[PDB]
Each structure stands twice: as structure tokens, then as C-alpha cells.
Design a protein around this nucleic acid. Structure first.
Length: 79
DNA sequence: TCAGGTATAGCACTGAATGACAAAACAAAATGGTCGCCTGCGACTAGAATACACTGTGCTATCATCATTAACT
């Protein structure tokens, strides 16, 4: 239920990060994976909004995916 | 023309030269110890919710294959 509710937030972040990269579908899948990984560790005791945490996790996932994938040769994240 | 002789070659003989085996030393190569960098993984808590991809081949020249429309039976 949380994933189905936040799919719209995921696609909104994807639209805010509209780069060609590999493909929009791969970026949406990476955002969904990041959303799931954030939900698996999220709690409401902080008294803040889940939107910021989910956005940070999706940004990290997209950065890792564009640093590793979306290229012929594999380039590390530090490079 | 026959013969003494000097030039040239074979023969008797100890002792120095030349073979075979083993050991010590140096250089080339593979294996192992060690240092610093590359890299794989996790976390950062104000709010951010289908609008950003975007289109552009252009309507050539016909030719043949598949379900819906209309109507004869």
C-alpha cells in the first residue's frame, strides 16, 4: 500500500530528474527500489515527513545507477 | 763408375700436458611478504506527489493480408 501510494512521488522525482541516461524506465525502477529500501527502514517517530527521506534515498539510488550503469565501460562512483 | 758424406726419416725413453668427476659461487627466475590505493556498501530526517519526456516522418508508388460493415439469402 505504501509503495502504491508513493509511486506518484517516485514518478514526480523522475520527472524532476529528467535525464536521458539509459532510459526513463530504468530510472523509474531504480527509484522504486530506493523507495522500497527506504520503507524497509523508515519510522514515523522522527515526527518529520516521509517525502524528504524517500527523496534522499531515490536520489542516492539514481546517482549509484547513473555512476555504475548507463555507460559502456564501468566507472566507479568516486571517479 | 764405385764410394765418403751430409741431408732427411724412423726408433728408445721419462716426464710434463690433457680428461673426467665433483664442489663452491654468481646471476636469472619464480614464489612469498608487505605497503598504499581502488573499490563495495551504508547513511544524510524542513517540504518537495502523472508533467516531464517532448514531435518532425512530412501526404512517394503502388501491392498484397487481416477483421468490422452492409446486405443477399
Amino acid at each position: 500500500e505504501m509503495v502504491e501510494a508513493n509511486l506518484r512521488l517516485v514518478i514526480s522525482i523522475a520527472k524532476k530528474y529528467t535525464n536521458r541516461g539509459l532510459q526513463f524506465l530504468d530510472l523509474i525502477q531504480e527509484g522504486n527500489i530506493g523507495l522500497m529500501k527506504a520503507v524497509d527502514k523508515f519510522e514515523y517517530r522522527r515526527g518529520y515527513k516521509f517525502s524528504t527521506y524517500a527523496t534522499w534515498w531515490i536520489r542516492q539510488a539514481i546517482t549509484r545507477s547513473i555512476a555504475d550503469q548507463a555507460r559502456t565501460i564501468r566507472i566507479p562512483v568516486h571517479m
